[PDB]
Amino acid sequence: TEYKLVVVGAGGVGKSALTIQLIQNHFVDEYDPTIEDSYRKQVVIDGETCLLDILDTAGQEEYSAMRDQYMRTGEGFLCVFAINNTKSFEDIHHYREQIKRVKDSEDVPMVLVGNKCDLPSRTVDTKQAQDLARSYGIPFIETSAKTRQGVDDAFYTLVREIRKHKEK
Ligand SMILES: Nc1nc2c(ncn2[C@@H]2O[C@H](COP(=O)(O)OP(=O)(O)O)[C@@H](O)[C@H]2O)c(=O)[nH]1
């Protein structure tokens, strides 16, 4: 019954930084006497227990066998680029197309995230990203793992997108 969230995007856009921040804000210790030591950590976002995974496709993951498995298992996807990395924005479409193909669905919960919005070097405008998100039919939000701007909102929005999808 857990919501399965997957964070995708080019290397270095801040997927780990965003996910670490979310866990730091929202992890709790839950009593469960049916497990070994009786307590397990979990993340609760907007009243939903959430599992979290990060999908990289470059670096060490250039050798991975698991890309499609991440996309099949994930129920909603944070598609992250960095506002100071034009290439990472240009990479977004490929990730979305792969997810849609692997899941064989036109209705996949997603949120477009423009991270590193605290940095003064901007090469991807808000308008560009909002136009892309509108074409996809998904929300767009700008975030900064450094200043914490938008981080919680990005994950909370994705949870609501998954919730609506499961309501259908
Ligand atoms: N200024 C700034 N730097 C960030 C932000 N998020 C991540 N970084 C930095 O970008 C670099 C790569 O981030 P990382 O989380 O490893 O990206 P990943 O490869 O997508 O998981 C690190 O040095 C982070 O400190 C942000 O919002 N603002």
Residue numbers in the entry: 2 to 169
Publication excerpt:
RAS proteins are binary molecular switches that cycle between active guanosine triphosphate (GTP)-bound and inactive guanosine diphosphate (GDP)-bound states. In the active state, RAS proteins interact with a variety of effector proteins, such as RAF kinase, PI3K, and RalGDS, leading to activation of downstream signaling pathways. The role of magnesium as an essential cofactor for small GTPases is well established as it is required for both high-affinity nucleotide binding and GTP hydrolysis. To examine the effect of N-terminal modification on the tertiary structure of KRAS, we carried out structural studies on KRAS constructs containing iMet (unprocessed N-terminus), lacking the iMet (partially processed N-terminus), and KRAS lacking the iMet and with N-acetylation of the second amino acid (fully processed N-terminus).
Since we obtained higher resolution data (1.5 Å) using KRAS (2–169) and the electron density was observed up to residue 169, we selected this structure for subsequent analysis. Surprisingly, no electron density was observed for the Mg2+, and switch I is in a fully open conformation with residues 26–30 forming an additional β-strand denoted as β’. The β’-strand forms an antiparallel β-sheet with the β2 strand which is no longer a part of the central β-sheet. In the absence of Mg2+, the S17 side chain atom points away from the β-phosphate of GDP. An electrostatic surface representation of Mg2+-free KRAS-GDP reveals a new shallow pocket between the switch I region and the nucleotide binding pocket that may be amenable to structure-based drug discovery approaches. The lack of the iMet in Mg2+-free KRAS (2–169)-GDP structure results in residues T2 and E3 forming a loop structure (instead of being part of the β1 strand) that points away from the central β-sheet. A smaller β1 strand results in smaller β2 and β3 strands within the central β-sheet and as a result, residues within the turn between β2-β3 strands and the β3 strand (interswitch region) undergo a register shift by two amino acids. A register shift of two amino acids in the β3 strand results in replacement of residue A59 with D57. A structural superposition shown in Fig. 3d shows that the side chain atoms of D57 sterically clash with the water molecules coordinated to Mg2+ resulting in displacement of Mg2+ from the nucleotide binding pocket. To our knowledge, the open conformation of switch I observed in the Mg2+-free KRAS-GDP structure is farthest from the nucleotide binding pocket in all the small GTPase structures solved thus far.
